[PDB]
């Protein structure tokens, strides 16, 4: 039986700017680095950056909707978004759903998100206003 | 600050087979589906499957090393991996370069992994068998 997400691994084209982005800009804790990768944590999340020459710096119009959302409190959301904006981090989508969300790109074009709110909160909102064809289990 | 992974969203080309893969084959909990997506949980992980006409079924030699690992206990690991193998689930990696792991593909070629062990355990193992150039902070 699977008990949760063990780790998220992102392929990166250049290790140093990716470490700077996740550790310094996004505030994650750097635990180890080697010639071809790094391990960071963000709360319970174990993040691995893996140096991969096959990683392309990918414009957001050229990748699908797969994305990684990090939790932040409502109280901290606006100042963190402003930090990303000051750093010139590109946005790939505007928020149109429930709960605050900021959609931003990493140096290689990985699609990231800041989101406020849990699955339970989303399901409660959906019960009141179900999406087209929505069924609950 | 950021406190962990709020959710993982995977773009999928065909919703029903992807829901079946994560719910029936991997045992995740299905909470809701709709015409264009589904919400599942795996322990504390919120997984969203999002129907995306841009998603392509991607062979593993065409994608980079970005991947998603799910936690499983030492007692359950081998029989779960063997069940996926017997079910014909495609693979993408054989060499255990990061501990006890089984590497497999979802229907769209998303790179998945079963892994036994925490970040702390991986750091302790790496102190004895470090990756080239490894430094610990
Ligand atoms: C909305 O929940 C479900 C569950 C199982 C299947 C489906 C679905 O796509 N169908 C069922 C009738 C034909 C199309 C939806
Ligand atoms: Mn999202
Ligand atoms: Mn892994």
TrEMBL record, chains A, B:
Its EC number is 2.5.1.18. The lineage of its organism: Bacteria, Pseudomonadati, Pseudomonadota, Gammaproteobacteria, Enterobacterales. Gene3D superfamilies: 2,3-Dihydroxybiphenyl 1,2-Dioxygenase, domain 1. The gene is fosA. SUPFAM superfamilies: Glyoxalase/Bleomycin resistance protein/Dihydroxybiphenyl dioxygenase. It comes from the Bacteria. This is FosA family fosfomycin resistance glutathione transferase. Keywords: Metal-binding, Transferase. It is an enzyme of class 2 (transferase). Mn(2+) binds at residues 7, 67, 113. It holds the Pfam family Glyoxalase.
